[PDB]
Homo-oligomer: A and B are copies of this chain.
Amino acid sequence: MSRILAVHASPRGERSQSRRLAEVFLAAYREAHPQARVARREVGRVPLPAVTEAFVAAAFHPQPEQRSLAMQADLALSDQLVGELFDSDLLVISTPMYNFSVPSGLKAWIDQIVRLGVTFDFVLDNGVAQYRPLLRGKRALIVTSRGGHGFGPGGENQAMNHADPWLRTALGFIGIDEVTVVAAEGEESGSFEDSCDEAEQRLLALARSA
The chain A residues found within 8 Å of chain B, CB to CB, are 8, 11-16, 19, 23, 40, 42, 45-56, 68-74, 76-77, 98-105, 107-108, 110-111, 114, 124, 127-129, 147-148, 160, 162, 165-166, 169-170, 173, 188-189
Given A13-B53, A162-B165, A162-B166, do A100 and B45 touch, yes or no (CB 8 Å)?
no
Q: Which of B68, B74, B129, B173 interacts with A46 by CB under 8 Å?
A: B74
Instruction: Tell me the dominant secondary structure on chain A's binding face.
Output: mixed
Most buried by B among A14, A52, A111: A52
A105: chain B residues within 8 A (beta carbon): 50, 104
Q: Which residue in chain B gives the minimum CB-CB distance to A105?
A: B50
A11 and B50 form a contact (CB under 8 A)? yes
Report the Cα distance A188→B14, complex, angstroms: 27
Sample (20) of A-B pairs whose CB atoms are under 8 Å apart: A11-B56, A13-B54, A13-B70, A14-B68, A14-B70, A15-B53, A40-B73, A40-B76, A42-B73, A45-B54, A45-B73, A46-B76, A48-B50, A50-B104, A51-B98, A100-B166, A104-B108, A128-B189, A162-B165, A166-B166
